[PDB]
Amino acid sequence: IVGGQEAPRSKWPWQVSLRVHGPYWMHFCGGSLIHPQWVLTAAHCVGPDVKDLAALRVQLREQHLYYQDQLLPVSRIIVHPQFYTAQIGADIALLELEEPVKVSSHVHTVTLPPASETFPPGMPCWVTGWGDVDNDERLPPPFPLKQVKVPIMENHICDAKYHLGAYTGDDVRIVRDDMLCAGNTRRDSCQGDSGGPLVCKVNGTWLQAGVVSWGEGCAQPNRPGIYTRVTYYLDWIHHYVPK
Amino acid sequence: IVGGQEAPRSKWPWQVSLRVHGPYWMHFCGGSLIHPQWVLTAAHCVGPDVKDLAALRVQLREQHLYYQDQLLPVSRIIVHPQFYTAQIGADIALLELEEPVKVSSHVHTVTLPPASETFPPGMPCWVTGWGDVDNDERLPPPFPLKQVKVPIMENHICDAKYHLGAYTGDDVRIVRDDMLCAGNTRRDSCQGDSGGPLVCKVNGTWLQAGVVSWGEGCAQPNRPGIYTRVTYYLDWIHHYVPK
Amino acid sequence: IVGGQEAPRSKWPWQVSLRVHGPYWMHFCGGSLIHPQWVLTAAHCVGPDVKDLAALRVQLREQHLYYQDQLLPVSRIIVHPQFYTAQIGADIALLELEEPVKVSSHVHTVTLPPASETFPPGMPCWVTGWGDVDNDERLPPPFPLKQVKVPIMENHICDAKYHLGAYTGDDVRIVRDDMLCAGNTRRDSCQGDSGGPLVCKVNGTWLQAGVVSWGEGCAQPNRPGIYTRVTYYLDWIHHYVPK
Amino acid sequence: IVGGQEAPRSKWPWQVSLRVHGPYWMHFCGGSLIHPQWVLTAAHCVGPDVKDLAALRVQLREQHLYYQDQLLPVSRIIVHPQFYTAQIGADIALLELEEPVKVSSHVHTVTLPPASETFPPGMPCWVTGWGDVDNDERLPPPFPLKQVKVPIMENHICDAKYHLGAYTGDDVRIVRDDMLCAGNTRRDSCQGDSGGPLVCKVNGTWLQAGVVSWGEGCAQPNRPGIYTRVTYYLDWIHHYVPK
Ligand SMILES: *[C@@](O)(c1noc(Cc2ccc(OCCc3ccc(Cl)c(Cl)c3)cc2)n1)[C@H](CCCCN)NC(=O)c1ccc(F)cc1
Ligand SMILES: *[C@@](O)(c1noc(Cc2ccc(OCCc3ccc(Cl)c(Cl)c3)cc2)n1)[C@H](CCCCN)NC(=O)c1ccc(F)cc1
Ligand SMILES: *[C@@](O)(c1noc(Cc2ccc(OCCc3ccc(Cl)c(Cl)c3)cc2)n1)[C@H](CCCCN)NC(=O)c1ccc(F)cc1
Ligand SMILES: *[C@@](O)(c1noc(Cc2ccc(OCCc3ccc(Cl)c(Cl)c3)cc2)n1)[C@H](CCCCN)NC(=O)c1ccc(F)cc1
């Protein structure tokens, strides 16, 4: 996370850390608990190539990475079949846990938005994770969960910005309709925030608008953060995850 | 180049090295001389973001990088306007030299194929360059120009291979119609060969079939090298380069 | 620590972590609390070149580095004036804290040996710290304090081992009389344990025999860990530290 | 080499490159040809631990590293038996080639100084090699042999400078009597120049005064370059090398 602050312990009870087997169980991406048995993440965290499920675990909400790990094994990785790269789109995946988790006020699911919600500019939205605090700058120990409030911008505005300082023709769409844009040169997600949630408070409910997907660096001029637009993939999610 | 050998001095008179300003004029990509004043390369070498022409030079055929440099300034970079990433496609660009080169038997142009030419599967073609000799393995000093014979593979077969061990749906195209495929787990192009030529000898003439574009690593199982299909972009090339 | 285990919370109440100012207060060396206002460490941690006291802090015993830091400022660095390199010797230094520590069962001082004490070969001693777990292998998060039992070895035997597979003449001393030797190819101290204590239980009391100094890598054949011999420098320590 | 310039082809016919077996025969130290069968270098380049001779070769003078290699195998490595570290001293070694080389005006031996020559300040002296051009700054391709004129300073002056900004007591000698000091903040040897020659022209003959040994970084304030003093080790050299 670029800008923002350490999250209060009572905020973001759906935040998860994805861990890869190595010298230790290392954080490589975020996710969100959308069901006691299901984690929502980015496809680019777990694909497009098929990996050994034994090499993956999930960690539920931790204030500080690694200090109190209780790792959960995964039974299934489901990756959107249209996914190949984040810039092409369909950057969305599901992890099925081997067992349902016990939910509480400290650890519980995020609400998915209804199909009609567009998340226009001036919506209050937050992105959370344990990623880099700037381009090529690691989150230092003790690895506190960060949050930052990011301004939403309309896709067409964001598309026009991505074309400034580029050879790409103005008519060749960069920011696609299954994507959502937020952030500026002080407030963004960064490497290690991938797969984590962008959440907006709508009529007193926290809704997941986005999955951290991609950008040209982090907090760079005319290069806002890009997110998988959750409303676009509700029917695909609801094929796997009970309502 | 993976699984290659050092090129004879008399072969590949069209090979060029692209150089970026730093502590020295470092090789970052290949190219081909298609006209005395024009170099053909990959868009991803020089875009999609706009670069300073002052930081770029061209070096014509060298047996060993850096030994006998005579660096040429570039007057214009023309990146295909449909280019954003190599996986989306249109991975092709033109460098206009500030002066035409005086051609010789040692340094001269490659022939572009006719629009009709379909380089059939199995045909023996060659790819050349000063790139890595394996995944994350640098070409050692003294940096000899390398060559490897790579068989052409039909797009449908190559697309099918990229789907093996992948979550991507079989009906979702990975290798697109403006791309061409060559190589196996012993013979491939690699990082630093980007923008360089894939050449095939047809009716006793060397024709440039491909521009080194992308792949999943180098010489990996079921991940052949992907190239920009030159026949696809002949009308765009001929818009700038005299016939 | 090589071949160790995580320390019980009740053990090694004198262990300290030395911290340098940067993007965070990073652990670079160990130390021991020998008096409420004094830390014993290696000269090579803090010399021979003069450093800014503002850039140094001390952290008293913590089970996991960085998690619950309470960083203590240092009023003075005293590096033995005969120190230039660890292999020459006098690898010993004192940090004077700005305030005396309030001692407890969890955090308190280690006992210095009497001048006469000869820690005989084969005696069970312990070395502790947050250093590497093998050659160029970092302690993973969450950075637990580690411990390993290492047998004391006679200087003459240790000197003889350093000469095996070396050009150095057998009559040319490598392990000097102000040094002490411990460890084998399964059990050693390593990079980041420097300045930490080697403690031995004598007549029911923990005595500090050694300060982690140097070696040829960690746990290498015929290259035991070398330590500053504390008994050798008692008169220098007691010049500054009340008895 | 810090400061100075590329050496003319006609200068330093005694300069040698030491090569270690890896992905390529990589330069790690310099040397000097003192006899058709013998190379003079630093002990720290080849010791104190015994290595496999098959992993070492010698390259005689080349203007550009790697471009025209004709590598020579070594029959013997002879390291001063008093050597353990450069700062302790006796930083001197001999390589015996398997065959005598053919000498010419382009490749020939350097003259050793007579026992009485002290090399006082104001002597014109040069140091040569393919080492770093500044602290952690590699010689760029094409790796030209560099030279720099370095001012000699008296041992006592150099010893006093090494004490400025240090804890080491003023009467604890750092610069030892078997060592020689040259350089300033514009002109020095650096990492990769180790084992190479410091040569001074005395009564129209080039004499090797020094072997590149050590320093605190390169061209740093109050830290001139330190060399093994060749006159100190003449009797040891003459045990092995014919006059
Ligand atoms: C994401 O934070 C991000 N950062 O890096 C990535 C890519 C990445 C890196 C490592 C891994 O490790 C997977 C290991 C593994 C092993 C075994 C098993 Cl079984 C499994 Cl499942 C996994 C995966 C993925 N993603 C950032 C966010 C940027 C936000 C900018 N505002 N995204 C990118 O860096 C990025 C992604 C894709 C792009 F096309 C461009 C940029
Ligand atoms: C290509 O060999 C390759 N290798 O690296 C690249 C990417 C790359 C990296 C650096 C640069 O630097 C140019 C910077 C610069 C600065 C100043 C100025 Cl003025 C200019 Cl013009 C430019 C450019 C490009 N490409 C390989 C080939 C793989 C072959 C496999 N068989 N391709 C990739 O590595 C690759 C490219 C694109 C992708 F989407 C994936 C993979
Ligand atoms: C020690 O564990 C060790 N590990 O690294 C060292 C060297 C070292 C590296 C960095 C620093 O940082 C000091 C920075 C600093 C900045 C500001 C301020 Cl204000 C201050 Cl005071 C300081 C210090 C020291 N030492 C190991 C133990 C090996 C045990 C093997 N059995 N020792 C070595 O690595 C070693 C030391 C000396 C040698 F000559 C050789 C080897
Ligand atoms: C020297 O230029 C220098 N630079 O690095 C060294 C140390 C060094 C590095 C690599 C190797 O390779 C060993 C490979 C090998 C493999 C097989 C076989 Cl068979 C053999 Cl024989 C060898 C060896 C040694 N030395 C610089 C010069 C500094 C000049 C400052 N004005 N010296 C140092 O960096 C240095 C040496 C010793 C010190 F105590 C401090 C500094």
Residue numbers in the entry:
A (entry chain A), B (entry chain C), C (entry chain B), D (entry chain D): 16 to 258
Please give me the paper's original passages concerning this structure.
Among these proteases, tryptase, a tetrameric serine protease, is one of the most abundant and functionally significant enzymes in mast cell granules. Tryptase is implicated in extracellular matrix (ECM) remodeling and inflammatory diseases, including asthma, chronic pain, fibrosis, and cancer progression. Due to its central role in mast cell-mediated responses, tryptase inhibition has emerged as a promising therapeutic strategy for conditions linked to excessive mast cell activation.
The compound with the highest affinity (KD = 2.1 nM) was the bivalent inhibitor #2d, whereas the one with the lowest affinity (KD = 81 nM) was the corresponding monovalent compound #2m, while compound #1 showed an intermediate affinity (KD = 12.3 nM). The docking studies not only provided insights into hydrogen bonding and polar interactions but also suggested that compound #1 could form a reversible covalent bond with the catalytic Ser209 residue. To experimentally confirm the effective mechanism of action of compound #1, we have solved the crystal structure of its complex with tryptase. The experimental electron density clearly shows that the compound #1 is covalently bound with C12 of the electrofilic carbonyl group with the hydroxyl group of the active site serine residue, Ser209, forming a reversible hemiketal (hemiacetal), in agreement with the SPR-derived Kd values. In particular, it represents an example of covalent-reversible inhibition of serine protease. Based on a distance of less than 3.5 Å of the donor and acceptor atoms, we identify nine specific hydrogen bonds of the ligand compound #1, namely to the main chain atoms of Ser204, Ser228, Cys205, Gly207, and Ser209, as well as the side chain atoms of Ser204, Gln206, and His59. According to the above distance criteria, we also suggest the presence of additional hydrophilic interactions with the main chain atoms of Trp229, Ile241, Gly232, and Arg238. The crystal structure of the complex confirms the binding mode hypothesized by docking studies, retrieving almost all the key interactions. The X-ray crystal structure of compound #1 confirmed a 4:1 stoichiometry, showing that four molecules bind per tryptase tetramer, each occupying an independent active site. A comparison of the crystal structures of tryptase complexed with compound #1 and the previously resolved structure of tryptase bound to compound #2d revealed an RMSD value of 0.53 Å, indicating that no significant conformational changes occurred within the tryptase tetramer upon binding either monovalent or bivalent inhibitors.
